[PDB]
Amino acid sequence: SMIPHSWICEKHILWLKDYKNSSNWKLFKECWKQGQPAVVSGVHKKMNISLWKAESISLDFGDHQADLLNCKDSIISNANVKEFWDGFEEVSKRQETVVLKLKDWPSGEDFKTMMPARYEDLLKSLPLPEYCNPEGKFNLASHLPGFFVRPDLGPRLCSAYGVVAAKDHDIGTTNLHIEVSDVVNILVYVGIAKGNGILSKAGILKKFEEEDLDDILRKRLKDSSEIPGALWHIYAGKDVDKIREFLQKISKEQGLEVLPEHDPIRDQSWYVNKKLRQRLYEEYHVRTCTLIQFLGDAIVLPAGALHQVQNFHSCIQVTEDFVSPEHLVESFHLTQELRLL
Question: Which parts of the sequence bind Fe cation?
Fold first, then answer.
């Protein structure tokens, strides 16, 4: 009856250590009720390696044109999809180089229909299936009529460079934002970049080690079988109002503050860098949870939580609005009353 686990971020996040343990949902249930996020590690061991590599995604889907975003300014880049992928692990092939992201490509029904093998593999591999799989007893997603859920309810593939080559840790690959539904975020591929004098795998490990981490996290990082990809900062949903007030104030101390009653959280315009996070804590006593997402880690966030992401290596993440076996009771009404209003 043992479910291997620990807590990280001063007991804010449950770490389920065994993706293979079929009772994970029993412990998750109790922490989730309290609004605690969770991380399930090792999900890449269930997944089909060959579907999720950059090389295979690039080959299979490289013919579809899409916009590339420069993560520093969120302006659409001149780069096309082929040049994006060419630069994923080869810094010399990048447009100082910039941090590009291919966001939500593909996503929603198109992910399901145009990448059906990946979609099938995702379904088979989702952790906490009672809560995250469409057929889960506790997942309402498939059940709620149209009006009550986000219109974009579905899987999303995101791929982006790490910020390391640009040498600019003020860049977020995912800016601070709120989740309208519960979501699970799986890091499915980590690409080590080379070229143009970029810091090596070992130097990037050192860069991870220089962050303010929990003892538990540093220990994980010492394990050469685990591959760290991205740095996350996660906020409790109950702190949303204070964070918004803080960013508005910071916006006013800059220029920026022309428009009245702008919502910097809705705008998705901020990456809250180290200096700002420190200032936020002092001024509002809002704590930052720091996580490192390693390959195979599935980060499970409740509706209302806020987070931002900064890839260090190149990363491919798949997100699912996160469905749910075993509670034909709880989360089979967060899309039984949520497709619907």
Answer: 177, 179, 307
Calculate the CA dihedral of residues 47, 48, 52, 54 and round it to 10 degrees.
Answer: 140
Binding site as annotated, residues: 177, 179, 307
The amino acid present at 304, given as its one-letter code, is: G
| Residues whose CB falls within 8 Å of the CB of residue 27, separated by 6 or more in sequence, listed in order | 3, 5, 14, 16
The CATH number, out of the four listed (2.60.120.650, 3.30.2350.10, 3.40.50.150, 3.40.980.10), of the domain defined by the range 5-125+156-320? 2.60.120.650
Segments making up each domain of the chain, as ranges: 5-125+156-320
Q: Tell me the three-class secondary structure of the chain, residue by residue.
A: CCCCEEEECCCCEEEECCCCCCCHHHHHHHHHHCCCCEEECCHHHCCCHHHHCHHHHHHHHCCCCCCCEECCCCEECCCCHHHHHHCCCEHHHCCCCCCEEECCCCEHHHHHHHCHHHHHHHHHHCCCHHHHCCCCCCCCCCCCCCECCCCCCCCEEEEECCCCCCCCCCCCCEEEEECCCCEEEEEEEEECCECCCCCCHHHHHHHHHCCCCCHHHHHHHCCCCCCEEEEEEEECHHHHHHHHHHHHHHHHHCCCCCCCCCCHHHHCCCCCCHHHHHHHHHHHCCCCEEEEEECCCEEEECCCCEEEEEECCEEEEEEECCCCCCCCCCCCCCCCCCCEC
Binding residues for Fe cation: 177, 179, 307
Experimentally, the structure was elucidated by: X-ray
